[PDB]
Subunit: 72 residues, 3 copies
Amino acid sequence: TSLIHSLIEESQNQQEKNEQELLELDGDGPQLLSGIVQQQNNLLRAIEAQQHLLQLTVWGIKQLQARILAVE
Amino acid sequence: TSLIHSLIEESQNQQEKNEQELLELDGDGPQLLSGIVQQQNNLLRAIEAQQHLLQLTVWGIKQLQARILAVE
Amino acid sequence: TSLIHSLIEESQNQQEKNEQELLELDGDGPQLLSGIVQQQNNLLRAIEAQQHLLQLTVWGIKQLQARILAVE
Ligand SMILES: COc1ccc(-c2ccc(CN(C(=O)c3cc(C(=O)O)c(C(=O)O)cc3C(=O)O)[C@H]3CCCc4ccccc43)cc2)cc1
C-alpha cells in the first residue's frame, strides 16, 4: 500500500530512465543492455502488480477488523 | 492472480535469456555485467518467494471473511 | 531467514559486489550501467518493503484471528 506506491514512483521513473538511456545507446555497449532493462521492466511489473495484490490483503484486514468490531 | 503469474513467468523467461546471453560472451568484455545478471537472478528468486508467501496471506483473508459469519 | 530473506540477503551482498565493480570499472561501459546499479537497489528496496508488508498482513491475520476465535 502507501510506502509501496512511493517506492514504485521512484523505481519506475529510474527504470524508465534506464530504458531512455538504452534508446540513446542502441549498440553503444553490450546487446545484453537491451535484455537487462527488459528484465528490470519485467521485475518492476511484478512489483507494480503486487501494488494491487498487496493492497487487497492490506485493506482486506483493515475492513475485516471493523466487521469483527461489530461483535468484539 | 493470473496476471502476477504471467509477470513472474515472463521475468523467469527473460532471466533465462539474460543468463544464456551472458554465457555467449565467454570470458572478458564488460565484466560488471556478470554482477548485474546475478542481481536480477536474486531479485527474480526473491520476487518468486514473496509471490509464494502472497498465497498464504490471501488464503487468510478468505479464511477470515468466511469465519466472520460464525461470529454472529 | 524464512525462505524470502535468503534471496534478499544474497541480493544485498550482490549490491556491494556491483558497487565495487562499478567503482573499479568507473571509466568503461555504457552510462546506462551506472543507473542500473542504483535502480536494481530500488527494486531490492521495493521487494524488501513489499516483504515487510507481507509480514504485516500475515501478522495482521493472526491478530484478527485471535479476536475472531474469541467470539466464533
Ligand atoms: C485491528 O486490526 C488491524 C488494524 C489495522 C491494521 C493495519 C494494516 C496495515 C497498515 C499499514 N498502512 C496501511 O495499510 C494504511 C493505513 C491507513 C490507516 O489506517 O489510517 C490508511 C488510511 O486509512 O488512509 C491507508 C493505508 C494504506 O497504506 O493504504 C500504512 C499506515 C502505517 C504505516 C505504513 C507503512 C508502510 C505502508 C503502509 C503503511 C496499518 C494498520 C492491521 C490490523
